Amino acid sequence: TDFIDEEVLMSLVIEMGLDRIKELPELWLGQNEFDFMTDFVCKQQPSRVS
Amino acid sequence: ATGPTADPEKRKLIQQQLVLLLHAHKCQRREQANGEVRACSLPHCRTMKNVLNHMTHCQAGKACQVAHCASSRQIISHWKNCTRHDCPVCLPLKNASDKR
Ligand SMILES: [Zn+2]
Ligand SMILES: [Zn+2]
Ligand SMILES: [Zn+2]
Secondary structure, three states: OOOOOHHHHHHHHHHHOHHHOOOOOOOOOOOHHHOOOOOOOOOOOOHHHO | OOOOOOOOHHHHHHHHHHHHHHHHHHHHHHHHOOOOOOOOOOOOHHHHHHHHHHHOOOOOOOOOOOHHHHHHHHHHHHHHHHOOOOOOOHHHHHHHHHHO
């Protein structure tokens, strides 16, 4: 064995509890809206503090 | 607040989608193996099975109205290169392999 197995995904489904799903939610990894592996660069303070 | 810009409920959703995406990739062979094996122990993988056939040929990414296509398409590009180290996506998937 050198790769993943369908029963290994079933084991992770049970580990996470994904058998309780009903509808799949949305994500936007193809846009600036959710850069899933970026850094906390957004830290700033408004012009009203100046 | 609870974490950095890249670590919200959307990352909890990539961990959920990853497992369904990997199951869908396997599950697509079960039906081709005989021609009528439509049955599955996780019916919810059908959403990913349908989306995989789209994202493997799609090119509209930045504006593709199928949010699941642009979403799922980014997961494997991350995972494949990240395998050299521990990560919220790669770590649980590597640990799960011990089951069989
Ligand atoms: Zn399935
Ligand atoms: Zn698409
Ligand atoms: Zn990773």
